[PDB]
């Protein structure tokens, strides 16, 4: 219905706004673009499902997210990929892991404060009806 299309459009506006606020944070720069195969050749072979904030924006615009739950699965993937690729005790790895957890924590905190629970429930019920 038109009301349901309006609901998903509001969802996309909300998700673009959250994603933009993450992408402009200097801490999260490393998560804003896919990994360069030239600088890091073994990334594509180690990380089977790469994810980054530019790809998240692309997926929003392709209508790939029908709920905030599905969006947070990709935020979680950005973070979990970073922890898996940088597991060592060296400061370079520890810095990226700290930033990855901060990205995840920040996304969840924005959503906890700004996502209306009844709006998410409506999205989920439309999704389940398709």
Ligand X SMILES: CC(=O)c1csc(NC(=O)C2C[NH2+]C2)n1
Which residues contribute to the site for ligand X (CB under 6 A)? 30, 35, 40, 82, 85-86, 92-93, 96
Query: How many degrees, rounded to 5, is the angle at CA 87 between CA 86 and CA 89?
Result: 105
Nearer to ligand X, 97 or 126 (CB): 97
Nearer to ligand X, 47 or 110 (CB): 47
Closest distance of CB 94 from ligand X, Å:
9
Cα–Cα nearest to 19, from 84, 106, 112: 106
State how far the Cα of 15 lies from the Cα of 75, in Å rounded to an integer. 11
Query: How many degrees, rounded to 5, is the angle at CA 128 between CA 127 and CA 130?
Result: 70
Nearer to ligand X, 36 or 116 (CB): 36
Of all residues in the shown chain, the one whose CB is closest to ligand X is 92
Closest distance of CB 15 from ligand X, Å:
21
């Amino acid at each position: 219905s038109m009301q349901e299309e309006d609901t998903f459009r509001e969802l996309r506006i909300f998700l673009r706004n959250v994603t933009h606020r993450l992408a402009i944070d200097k801490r999260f720069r490393v998560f804003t673009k896919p990994v360069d195969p030239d600088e890091v050749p073994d990334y594509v072979t180690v990380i089977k499902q790469p994810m980054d904030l530019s790809s998240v924006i692309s997926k929003i615009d392709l209508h790939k997210y029908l709920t905030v739950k599905d969006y947070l699965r990709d935020i979680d993937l950005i973070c979990s990929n970073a922890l898996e690729y940088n597991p060592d005790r060296d400061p370079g790895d520890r810095l990226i892991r700290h930033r990855a957890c901060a990205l995840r924590d920040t996304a969840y905190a924005i959503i906890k404060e700004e996502l209306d629970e009844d709006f998410e429930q409506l999205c989920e019920e439309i999704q389940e009806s398709r």
